[PDB]
Amino acid sequence: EVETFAFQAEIAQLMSLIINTFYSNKEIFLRELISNSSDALDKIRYESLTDPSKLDSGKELHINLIPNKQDRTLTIVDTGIGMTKADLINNLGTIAKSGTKAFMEALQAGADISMIGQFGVGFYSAYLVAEKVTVITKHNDDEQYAWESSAGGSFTVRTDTGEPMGRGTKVILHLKEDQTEYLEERRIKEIVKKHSQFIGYPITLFVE
Numbered sequence: 261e262v263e264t265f266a267f268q269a270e271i272a273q274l275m276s277l278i279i280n281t282f283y284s285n286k287e288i289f290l291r292e293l294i295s296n297s298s299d300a301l302d303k304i305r306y307e308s309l310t311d312p313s314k315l316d317s318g319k320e321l322h323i324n325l326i327p328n329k330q331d332r333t334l335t336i337v338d339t340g341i342g343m344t345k346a347d348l349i350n351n352l353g354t355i356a357k358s359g360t361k362a363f364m365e366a367l368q369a370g371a372d373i374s375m376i377g378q379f380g381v382g383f384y385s386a387y388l389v390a391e392k393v394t395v396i397t398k399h400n401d402d403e404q405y406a407w408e409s410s411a412g413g414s415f416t417v418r419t420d421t422g423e424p425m426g427r428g429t430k431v432i433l434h435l436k437e438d439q440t441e442y443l444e445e446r447r448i449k450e451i452v453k454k455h456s457q458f459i460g461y462p463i464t465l466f467v468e
């Protein structure tokens with residue numbers, strides 16, 4: 261059972277801009293994804309302060325970066341709050357329509373693509389480096405779902421058939437052929453140190 265949805269026109273336009281604009285500083289995608297993971301981790305941490313049972317689906321709050329050269333994928337896993345199916349469909353928990361309008365106006369007022377996170381839509385920067393993105397998520401109040409898109413105006417949602425995640429979100433970046441530097445350990449370490457050095461959860465870079 262796979263459900264196919266059209267992106268709202270504004271989101272499709274954001275994705276097209278990201279895909280088509282000449283912009284060399286692509287490495288910021290990682291900071292954006294890691295920031296989203298941190299925000300999700302903050303949410304479960306806060307909820308757990310008053311209801312510890314919310315951690316029954318996993319006590320550890322962390323971020324894992326998993327390169328796979330054989331599959332040409334970089335995977336960002338977190339044990340944050342997760343998203344419901346409804347939130348996945350509704351632009352992955354983001355205020356994407358309003359954020360996109362603001363980002364577009366800013367780009368006219370001198371901003372650059374690296375500022376995308378100021379507009380709540382940093383997730384879509386994944387398309388700087390990925391031909392396809394799969395987001396697998398589990399929230400305590402819902403089942404495990406997989407969202408996926410190769411852009412082109414549509415996305416799919418299905419009940420996930422992979423390994424259970426307990427709680428959290430996994431973003432799988434199916435990298436463009438010319439973007440394989442983002443699978444290299446030294447490159448990933450450099451980017452995390454540059455842009456994500458103060459994130460308040462352990463970031464573990466897996467090796468191959």
Ligand SMILES: COc1ccc(-c2c(-c3cc(C(C)C)c(O)cc3O)n[nH]c2NC(C)=O)cc1
Binds near residue numbers: 343
């Ligand atoms: C800035 O907008 C958002 C929107 C939603 C989340 C979010 C994620 C989550 C979302 C993404 C993207 C696919 C959007 C990701 O890369 C990693 C994540 O852990 N899980 N749970 C939540 N929910 C709350 C309340 O954070 C984070 C930031």
